[PDB]
From Swiss-Prot, chain A:
Subunit structure: Component of the ubiquinol-cytochrome c oxidoreductase (cytochrome b-c1 complex, complex III, CIII), a multisubunit enzyme composed of 10 subunits. The complex is composed of 3 respiratory subunits cytochrome b (COB), cytochrome c1 (CYT1) and Rieske protein (RIP1), 2 core protein subunits COR1 and QCR2, and 5 low-molecular weight protein subunits QCR6, QCR7, QCR8, QCR9 and QCR10.
Keyword Electron transport annotated: yes
Cysteine pairs bridged by disulfides in the record: none
Keyword Ribosomal protein recorded: no
Annotated function: Component of the ubiquinol-cytochrome c oxidoreductase, a multisubunit transmembrane complex that is part of the mitochondrial electron transport chain which drives oxidative phosphorylation.
A Pfam short name: Peptidase_M16_C
Gene3D superfamilies: Metalloenzyme, LuxS/M16 peptidase-like
Superkingdom of origin organism: Eukaryota
Record-linked SUPFAM superfamilies: LuxS/MPP-like metallohydrolase
Protein name, entry field: Cytochrome b-c1 complex subunit 1, mitochondrial
Taxonomic lineage from the root: Eukaryota, Fungi, Dikarya, Ascomycota, Saccharomycotina
UniProtKB/Swiss-Prot annotation, chain B:
Entry's transmembrane regions: 5-38
Primary role: Component of the ubiquinol-cytochrome c oxidoreductase, a multisubunit transmembrane complex that is part of the mitochondrial electron transport chain which drives oxidative phosphorylation.
Protein name: Cytochrome c1, heme protein, mitochondrial
Subunit structure, as described in the record: Component of the ubiquinol-cytochrome c oxidoreductase (cytochrome b-c1 complex, complex III, CIII), a multisubunit enzyme composed of 10 subunits. The complex is composed of 3 respiratory subunits cytochrome b (COB), cytochrome c1 (CYT1) and Rieske protein (RIP1), 2 core protein subunits COR1 and QCR2, and 5 low-molecular weight protein subunits QCR6, QCR7, QCR8, QCR9 and QCR10.
The organism of origin for this protein: Saccharomyces cerevisiae (strain ATCC 204508 / S288c) (Baker's yeast)
Note from the entry: Present with 39900 molecules/cell in log phase SD medium.
Gene transcribed to yield this protein: CYT1
Amino acid sequence: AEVTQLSNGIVVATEHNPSAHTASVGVVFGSGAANENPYNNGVSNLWKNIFLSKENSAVAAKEGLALSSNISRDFQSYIVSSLPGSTDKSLDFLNQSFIQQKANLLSSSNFEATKKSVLKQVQDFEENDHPNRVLEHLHSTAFQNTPLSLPTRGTLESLENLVVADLESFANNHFLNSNAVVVGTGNIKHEDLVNSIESKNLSLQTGTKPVLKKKAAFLGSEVRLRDDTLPKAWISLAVEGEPVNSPNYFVAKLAAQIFGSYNAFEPASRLQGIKLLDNIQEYQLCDNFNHFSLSYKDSGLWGFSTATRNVTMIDDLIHFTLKQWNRLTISVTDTEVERAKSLLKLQLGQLYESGNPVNDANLLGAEVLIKGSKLSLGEAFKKIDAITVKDVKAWAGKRLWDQDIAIAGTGQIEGLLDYMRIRSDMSMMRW
Amino acid sequence: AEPEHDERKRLGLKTVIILSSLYLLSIWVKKFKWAGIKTRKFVFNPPKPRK
């Protein structure tokens, strides 16, 4: 169960795991929905859907093998699951239908059907869903005029102005050989190490990825969509996280576990926890938490999110969460750090060791492109056992003391005071 | 008529200097923390006509 890298034209990384028996070859691209300017937003989505429709229709009738994909910010994650002993067919299909040719798939009728399906899907996502809506709005507001804030799906206005030529140009400017790993997560050992190097298994347009000019930034802003028709509320605070490949990633993740998740409709969640959960339960202040610390190569975000049925006590929820964040950098009980360490160990163990090979393939590709070499979870355990209260205190004092916050919540938000009793209260306590 | 001319003028000068400085600082701070709403922009969207 050891990961092996190399560099022979295309980086090939394998993580044998004899436990599961669903071999899943894959392809991962390091430039997704961030390295592209806002005027052509949904090109990655169009690629994703043309794949997932026509190639999914073809594969099963040809052989037996599913297929999936993903995109977060810079991840043309692109996976072809299979049986343990049919990976050569998977690579043959992947060669013959994804990198070449790109003309038989991009037919007019097929492209237009994909276009209308994507339009319908983005439309009803904008209508029905809500937490993901406010999350995308949070990203957009935190990175204004930065190639990081445009959504993964896109905007209908941007979608409507795409036919072929721009999709072809993106294909020729980001499907290179410089940044295209070939993941082999599953129960394959070395066939992936050799078959990936053949006569022509090499991406078209060898060259480099065109680097964007501006890097990133941060500045606080609101994109609220205040509308009283919807029943509940939604908020999403944020403070600038830690970028991947920094010696603060894991301590930030720990700071994103002391408070932890919550769900006020469970007998096993309303009762445990920390001081804020004791202080909230007296009334029905809130209805959900979600603490997270997202990180990307450009920069990272330390998240927060609720969905509160109560609409009049929003300010009290906000004030209590802010006081907890304020005092996280003044005094933390050592037992709190210990419990956070144990819980976070559990969370990473669950995430990295899911029985589904696709998620492991995704994460292996992510790390191998960004870090350059996978960091085994064992080293994660050893390097997290040494996180002491001094380190968390220092990191919190650096990242959470009078800092810009981005908030963008839909629903009924009129009870939320606008910006000064939501920011200048974030250090008011006499430290 | 008022054996307090000198002291009165001195105290008045001190007070006017302190107050002028304080007033300008208050102008600046008002321009500062009010700027979070003196520049917000609204963008209307015609809601979908369904009922």
